[PDB]
């Protein structure tokens with residue numbers, strides 16, 4: 001018998017992104033070569049199969065710093081982190097290969113899917 | 124130049140609710156008289172002006188237990204916590220006054236608004 | 247907003 | 252789903 005507020009999920013996500021912008025309650029630093037990204041573990045887990053596996057591990061759930069594979073592109077990671085917090089993916093000709101490789105590593109299936117479709121359209 | 128995944132915000136919220144159901148990364152217990160509710164501080168802050176004020180406070184942000192006012196109804200709080208994590212509000216004739224009073228206390232303006240409209244329709 | 251889901 | 256926002 002529930003009623004539903006249509007905009008609630010997007011309002012929550014917008015407020016989580018505002019917390020991230022203000023560095024409020026951020027609890028992990030993701031390191032991607034020379035770059036560092038502060039984030040909330042729960043948002044990362046909710047968006048990525050890799051982070052879900054990492055933060056449900058009984059030892060890794062306690063870490064405040066996670067180092068990604070050195071082959072991961074920081075700009076690709078930055079674009080995906082923004083997508084996690086906003087539903088918007090800044091996909092461009094100059095970044096699509098790095099975004100797709102990063103989404104494959106992070107296990108973000110819907111992003112891998114749109115990248116594959118955009119690449120197929122150019123060939 | 125971004126593209127947007129329509130279902131992303133609702134998928135994130137669904138995954139945050141799955142973490143709550145499995146007690147994964149929950150970092151606060153909200154006590155409402157004799158009842159206890161485990162939750163994620165960031166989701167509570169994103170949904171409630173009261174929790175935003177509490178967890179942005181330099182002392183209270185560190186607390187693992189928050190006690191609400193003894194006048195707050197636990198069922199009303201439970202209904203609102205479910206709404207935070209799902210966008211669905213289980214509003215019924217038998218709970219509407221408690222839900223509205225709890226939403227006023229938690230500073231959840233859209234919920235207070237729908238409660239006021241449902242009460243006005245019955246008079 | 248509010249709707250019947 | 253993907254759209255132009």
Ligand SMILES: Cn1c(=O)n(C)c2cc(Nc3cc(SCc4ccccc4)ncn3)ccc21
Nearest residue numbers: 045046047048049052107108109110138141142
């Ligand atoms: C593969 N994959 C993605 O493409 N994304 C966006 C993912 C997001 C998640 N995050 C979840 C899933 C679940 S229960 C579902 C589940 C759990 C483990 C494995 C597979 C499926 N609870 C909370 N957070 C997990 C995997 C994802």
Ligand SMILES: Cn1c(=O)n(C)c2cc(Nc3cc(SCc4ccccc4)ncn3)ccc21
Nearest residue numbers: 015018019168169170171172175230231232233
């Ligand atoms: C009054 N009120 C509500 O009805 N809800 C659903 C609220 C949710 C929030 N959570 C926010 C807001 C912001 S910035 C906006 C802001 C901040 C403080 C005061 C007022 C407004 N960043 C992250 N989480 C705050 C107040 C809320």
